[PDB]
Amino acid sequence: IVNAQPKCNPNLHYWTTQDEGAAIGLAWIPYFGPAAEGIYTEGLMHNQDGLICGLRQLANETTQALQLFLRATTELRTFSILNRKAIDFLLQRWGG
Amino acid sequence: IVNAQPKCNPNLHYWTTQDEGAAIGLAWIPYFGPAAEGIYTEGLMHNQDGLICGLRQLANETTQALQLFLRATTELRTFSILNRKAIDFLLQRWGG
Amino acid sequence: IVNAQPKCNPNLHYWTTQDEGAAIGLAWIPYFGPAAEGIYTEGLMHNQDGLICGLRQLANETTQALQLFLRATTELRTFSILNRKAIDFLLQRWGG
Amino acid sequence: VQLVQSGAEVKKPGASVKVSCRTSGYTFSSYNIHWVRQAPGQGLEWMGVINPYGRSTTLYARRFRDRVTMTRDTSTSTVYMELSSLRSEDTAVYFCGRLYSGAPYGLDVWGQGSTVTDIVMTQSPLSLPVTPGEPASISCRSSQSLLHSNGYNYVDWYLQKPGQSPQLLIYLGSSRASGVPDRFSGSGSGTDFTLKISRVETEDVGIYYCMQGLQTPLTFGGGTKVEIK
Amino acid sequence: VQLVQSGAEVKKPGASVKVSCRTSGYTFSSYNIHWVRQAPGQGLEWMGVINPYGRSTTLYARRFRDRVTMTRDTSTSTVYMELSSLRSEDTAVYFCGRLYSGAPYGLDVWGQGSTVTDIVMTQSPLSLPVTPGEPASISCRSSQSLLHSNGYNYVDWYLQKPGQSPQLLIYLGSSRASGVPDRFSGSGSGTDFTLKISRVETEDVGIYYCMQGLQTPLTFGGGTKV
Amino acid sequence: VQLVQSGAEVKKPGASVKVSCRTSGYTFSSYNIHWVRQAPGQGLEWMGVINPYGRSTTLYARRFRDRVTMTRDTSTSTVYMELSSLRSEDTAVYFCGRLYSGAPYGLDVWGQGSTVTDIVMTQSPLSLPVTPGEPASISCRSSQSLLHSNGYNYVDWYLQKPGQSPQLLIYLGSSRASGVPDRFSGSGSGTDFTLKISRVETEDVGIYYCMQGLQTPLTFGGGTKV
Amino acid sequence: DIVLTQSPDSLAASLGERATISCKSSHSVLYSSNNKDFFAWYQQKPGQPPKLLISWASTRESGVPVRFNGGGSGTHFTLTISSLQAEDVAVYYCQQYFSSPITFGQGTRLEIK
Amino acid sequence: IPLGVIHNSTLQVSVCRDKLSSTNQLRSVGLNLEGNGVATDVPSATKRWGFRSGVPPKVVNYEAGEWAENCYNLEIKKPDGSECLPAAPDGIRGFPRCRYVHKVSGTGPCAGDFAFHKEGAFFLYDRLASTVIYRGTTFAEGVVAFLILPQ
Amino acid sequence: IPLGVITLQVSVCRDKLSSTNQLRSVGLNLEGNGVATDVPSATKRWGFRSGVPPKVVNYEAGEWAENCYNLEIKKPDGSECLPAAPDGIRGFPRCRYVHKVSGTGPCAGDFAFHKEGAFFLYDRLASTVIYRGTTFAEGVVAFLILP
Amino acid sequence: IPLGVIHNSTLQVSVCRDKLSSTNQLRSVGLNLEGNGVATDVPSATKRWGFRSGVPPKVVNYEAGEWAENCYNLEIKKPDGSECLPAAPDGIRGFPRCRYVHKVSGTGPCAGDFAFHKEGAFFLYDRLASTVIYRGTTFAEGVVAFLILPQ
Amino acid sequence: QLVQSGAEVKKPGSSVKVACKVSGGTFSSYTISWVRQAPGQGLEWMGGIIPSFGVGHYSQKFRDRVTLTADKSTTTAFLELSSVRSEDTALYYCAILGTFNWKSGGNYFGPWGQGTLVTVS
Ligand SMILES: *[C@@H]1O[C@H](CO)[C@@H](O[C@@H]2O[C@H](CO)[C@@H](O[C@@H]3O[C@H](CO)[C@@H](O)[C@H](O)[C@@H]3O)[C@H](O)[C@H]2NC(C)=O)[C@H](O)[C@H]1NC(C)=O
Ligand SMILES: *[C@@H]1O[C@H](CO)[C@@H](O[C@@H]2O[C@H](CO)[C@@H](O[C@@H]3O[C@H](CO)[C@@H](O)[C@H](O)[C@@H]3O)[C@H](O)[C@H]2NC(C)=O)[C@H](O)[C@H]1NC(C)=O
Ligand SMILES: *[C@@H]1O[C@H](CO)[C@@H](O[C@@H]2O[C@H](CO)[C@@H](O[C@@H]3O[C@H](CO)[C@@H](O)[C@H](O)[C@@H]3O)[C@H](O)[C@H]2NC(C)=O)[C@H](O)[C@H]1NC(C)=O
């Protein structure tokens, strides 16, 4: 996680969609529902700056593997990288 | 699984394509064989007032989860919910 | 895996792209990268006559199951069948 | 369908408060439980939201973050609040309501409560004293237009009789709630929302509230207390 | 290519009859096997279908459901058929075919074996015994059209040579199966199906049966003796 | 950015040569490592390429394939090549090369090591007498067009000072590298290219080499003297 | 290029009948994210420049009677002359503008029977 | 998502006792709203569809369904004649088991790009369940529930 | 869907499945089976059908095609019979020779399926229908568990 | 593809102790180059996008993203007045959270079928990182990484 | 609304110029399109120009032998055939015809013109 990146930002202001905080009230039914922009929960990470710089560097390091994987794959919209990682992990451990 | 419905249908008549019989006999070459509406098989499930008249309330209780999942994701046509559930189940026990 | 086919071809010139080492050298960036058709690794088996047309006989055997499976499902591009195979495999082995 | 709350209690500023709301008569797993605070002289302030679903997700007002905690139990189908330090400023009754999580159909049922130690919507008229049998008009003004892309205004109007739980009058801008007399009629311009009281009767005297459900926080109106005079 | 089955057996009612159809000369899993029942002089009735490929799947006729079960074993590549509660009428000869799972291609090969205890189709001319050398025609008619989206009529025709197994002549509208004399030909217009024999020969004696393959059950016509 | 190759690697006929090449001042995983050979003769030969990233995929020339292997040190940050079936013709000077896997931005810095026992490209002069205070021009041509779909030209020029490790002059057609004076400009389009020293100073003399990166096996030109 | 074909080259119907014109594109001309499709019908009476009858294959232009109807998607598009009039006799043209070059159909001549 | 495991005779939402042998044991069933005792005539059912804009439609396949006594077909146009509904993308067709189709036609202006359900229920087309109504094709109204079938 | 594990065994604790890269899908061409590849016999194996959706599967490795076909046919009125080539579909990469088809006149439907029951390979996307303008080879897909 | 593992506050790139209880924690995070020492001005950044042809675009899903101080909306025009950036496909919209939108335009000489990134990054869009620039929708240039979150 | 000049007769193998003046609206950003209605042989869109960019987006079949110009000095679009042949006797219309941002400079549509007849001697 040694930053070869010239400059690390020590904090990030992030947004997520998997978290449930976007529609605690409001409603689930799309008919009475938020817009496409209301599906986002905010978050802040002043602390753990070393983690953030290391994560920057991980993003840098993993780019070319992603490019090679995309170039080989015929599927244009790949949403199964995390599922494939779960398969690889659990298959590696409990496969045989 | 308490049935909170006003009226619940005590019997069910299910059409299903996942039978592996499908065009039993007949043919399986796509050029020959059935049309788009000939694949389905059918059955009459009225086994008990436990499963039936309980599945309807299960649908009432799972519609909110399914709506939240669809509002979260960005993939237009989802086909890997069942696979994701299978992976969650299998990976929960063998966490290591 | 006995071949009833009239012709057995021991020669199997195979191109593939899953190797992920297809673009050694050149570039991995999509801008400076290779062409869309130059990302292929080429080889020949020379293992056994019985293995190659053994694969051909297997492909005849499995084309029926593949056609049935494609007729059952409604997704146009079924990119995820190897994931299905791995899930079935490891779930029948270590499931429950 | 009924909602019951915890009994009367008086606590030290050091001591925290534990308030229980118990449901009866409906599927506890689906309906949101909203907790609101009635402090005399300041109307109502929305304390927070709990979703009695499997993840049991919660949300609290910014002013009360990190001091109040909400937890449900499915065994008794109940919800619980625990505070941290109940200051004397918070000597206010605590109200539990249930709202259909599927749509902003308005708060339906209410409790009583007793604890003893943003889209600004300002109602324009502070008070309307009037003889009975004379129609009336009351409106509240919103800084931001509450019209939704659906076309349903999400303003909700509630009536609190003196010393009793708030009672729902209007939901979804203009639709009338169940059990409310057909006398009340609500109309919504999208920014300033009004209502015509057909005839004022003795029972209808009390404080009127407008709360919006378009965007959290769900802010309540100032509250116009109409009395017969 | 050659098919055999269990020899004729005799039993009394209230019990089970168990028969086999042994195969040879082809990819066992590839072809569906259709079981057919022939009462003496009553034509043919489709007992059922089994495809040994993969996990075995069996379909029975609704008239004989819950009284029959066929199952294949791949070790010796043999299909076994079991019948229970044998009524008096059940005494009939039993046949097993080798229809191609790919496309309707008739039933080229058959068996020989007996025992002792929808789309309706019609054969308008009952029987046409004629002096040899005379062209003859046979007509089959169905309630619902046999036209298919691909443009091929799934009609089939078979010859029941006296005291033998059915023999496949015209398959899939108008095509000719190998091993069949060229005198056999037919036209399928999708609603009525005609067969033109150019000149009746002494071998052409026997009853002709029409078959629909579009939808299960695979009903058979009454048949015409020529 | 410092790289050093192994020591004086003198062997005997048929012996195995294990030569190492260190990395310092830069990220080991990202940049590829090419290895090349310079015989006593003026020609240059591209020995092979190793990509340190991940599982360390390697590529070798069709000239000396499967006679030699390369291996990465994940922690030591050093790549080494071993060649076994040694012969007299293999006596040469092996060189390292740091090429960006991201784009053929040229080879930043090389090593130097000794050893003692297709896109054909050519250059015009192969030798050129020079006079101080003068411009100079060297042409380089290739069999296949080097106009990659990007619009860039995957053409490189390097100088080798007399008895020195080579230096990077021009990459990607006309974009000179940092540390190279403005006198060294290279133009071209498609098949033909040239390097025109705006004024050959008395200091900068040596051999010049023309390089392509469009298609592996990577190839080198003859070289021109200045 | 996107070449257009009109199945009815010359359709004639009597007064008061339902008139259908089908037009089959070589490519899809229905934009994906915005469900709007790019297809227009032109009514040219001889001796006059063509007038835009319906754009986006559905929306009717101002001044155009409700009689004129549009429908279809993807490749297959349909123009319906709901109730033929005496004045409706003219030629009708397809036009796609989903991607250049703009291509027009050969034309359908519609006249009183 | 509440996963409903099957008992030998009953249903339990959700233990090493619960076992499953392959993916075919996972079954997604589509149950129509008519099975919940909902009104089925056109004027009452039409009130359960509204128009919205700013939310994309998301589709989820389902493996099994039930016969629809009344399945609906919708084709509405605002008086400009524009097709207010989106076209049905390839891979979506009518609901395959319907007793009678209601070929509803309407002139109600569309204030939103899409038309959503007012009960949170899904629209069933073939082996897919979406959140928006599609032109021409016949759909049912129903909800998707996940189950494990017995061995 | 029969498996292939490695001799070739059609599927056991003996044969493990170490990692996901072991699974492979191979698009073997019918050329090995010994089928004729001339244009007029090949045209017989394709038939036009209506009422079946076009299904596509993904294969990861293929075999050099001695002959791949690039079909471009026109209905007599001029409309294209084949459907437009969808996104992410390109021609089969490793043809030696291409047998282009100028046209067959009448077209009875929209989709053209292979009568023998073999997929059309394209580029790493085996499909049951013939698309327009893209070079394809006839062949069938097998599934393997590699060492 | 390297995977990140966290102990308390440190990231470890992919130990038997390293455990992952459920798939829900697997998170794909996309980080903008605003804090990566990259000049965010219009003309410095415009050099990084270059036009190529004959390479299919690819799209990846990232669950979470970083705020963007500088995000670019491109509607590039060819010299004849035509637009050369490919049409935005369905399911892709602008970057959700951006402070300032750069409506950069007018770059005449675009001479390729697609526009790719000269540094190797992705264009984030809305939870859909792309290797190509789509016309009319705002984006931010950044990278996508995959992580397993601590329990 | 648009205006044009009258019919013109030209010897074969010469250069014919057809002028279309755009009056009303704004000449700066419109999508001038020229269509050749062959007499009884449908239509074909020869090409279009935007006066702001000043270079026409010629069609593939008419790139070789058609040149276009748009001048804001008198707000006129000029079309010139490099060579003329007999079959080019057809109605040349100038209109505001756009595409899906392929050449969209304004709205997707506009009013047509009277049309100029060109004949070959
Ligand atoms: C699951 O079953 C429940 C029980 O019926 C369904 O709840 C129903 O929800 C609708 C709207 O979400 C309610 O309609 C509303 O009624 C109030 C009554 O005043 C009215 O003011 C509103 O305008 C609206 O018409 C309906 O009353 C309610 N059922 C009951 C018995 O109260 C729910 O829809 C079902 N979920 C699924 C997915 O099928
Ligand atoms: C897999 O192996 C089977 C077994 O050989 C192959 O089946 C062959 O398919 C051909 C083509 O449909 C069939 O031949 C037919 O013969 C009749 C005779 O009248 C003729 O009318 C038909 O037009 C057709 O030519 C037959 O089922 C069979 N032939 C042979 C010699 O085996 C199948 O083709 C193989 N699959 C693949 C994908 O290669
Ligand atoms: C991850 O971080 C590394 C480290 O900086 C990045 O590599 C660097 O990328 C820049 C481009 O932004 C390169 O600058 C260019 O260099 C060429 C010469 O090769 C020059 O001609 C250009 O004008 C430009 O300045 C730089 O060389 C390269 N390497 C280093 C050590 O900085 C990489 O881009 C980052 N990855 C991502 C996805 O951001």
XYZ file of N, CA and C and ligand atoms in Angstrom, chain B residues 4-6 60 63, chain D residues 100 105 171 178, chain H residues 33 36 118-119 121 143, ligand 1:
84
model
N -52.967 -12.112 6.905
C -53.669 -10.862 7.156
C -54.505 -10.418 5.966
N -54.626 -11.258 4.945
C -55.359 -10.885 3.750
C -56.860 -10.820 4.029
N -57.590 -9.989 3.281
C -59.055 -10.009 3.407
C -59.644 -11.349 3.012
N -46.728 -10.641 0.156
C -46.965 -9.350 0.805
C -45.792 -8.901 1.661
N -42.452 -8.190 -0.812
C -42.483 -7.176 -1.862
C -41.659 -5.952 -1.491
N -48.001 3.939 7.219
C -47.749 2.912 6.222
C -46.444 3.218 5.499
N -49.126 8.019 3.468
C -50.553 8.086 3.747
C -50.875 8.843 5.023
N -54.772 13.704 4.417
C -53.553 13.055 3.976
C -53.462 13.116 2.459
N -59.925 8.253 6.940
C -61.054 7.435 7.352
C -61.610 7.926 8.682
N -52.347 -10.740 -7.774
C -53.052 -9.981 -6.756
C -54.497 -10.424 -6.615
N -55.380 -12.392 -3.709
C -55.468 -11.682 -2.447
C -56.843 -11.063 -2.243
N -49.662 1.312 -7.754
C -49.927 2.054 -6.529
C -49.946 1.176 -5.288
N -49.747 -0.129 -5.432
C -49.736 -1.036 -4.294
C -48.368 -1.636 -4.024
N -46.996 -3.644 -5.997
C -46.967 -4.914 -6.691
C -46.249 -4.762 -8.028
N -47.047 -10.457 -7.266
C -45.857 -10.313 -6.440
C -45.005 -11.567 -6.562
C -50.862 -6.757 1.459
O -52.121 -6.818 2.062
C -52.519 -5.560 2.625
C -53.860 -5.791 3.279
O -54.917 -5.483 2.382
C -52.581 -4.474 1.548
O -52.743 -3.223 2.205
C -53.616 -2.342 1.478
O -52.883 -1.234 0.954
C -53.678 -0.293 0.215
C -52.729 0.751 -0.323
O -51.380 0.428 -0.014
C -54.757 0.292 1.119
O -55.583 1.179 0.375
C -55.672 2.435 1.088
O -56.775 2.433 1.988
C -56.889 3.636 2.765
C -58.015 3.453 3.765
O -58.546 4.742 4.062
C -57.148 4.795 1.808
O -57.212 5.997 2.555
C -56.034 4.883 0.758
O -56.321 5.929 -0.161
C -55.832 3.556 0.045
O -56.999 3.343 -0.725
C -55.597 -0.827 1.720
O -56.532 -0.291 2.649
C -54.700 -1.839 2.427
N -55.491 -2.942 2.948
C -56.171 -2.871 4.097
C -56.936 -4.099 4.485
O -56.169 -1.859 4.792
C -51.319 -4.446 0.690
O -51.540 -3.657 -0.473
C -50.925 -5.854 0.257
N -49.646 -5.833 -0.432
C -49.432 -6.454 -1.594
C -48.053 -6.325 -2.161
O -50.313 -7.091 -2.161
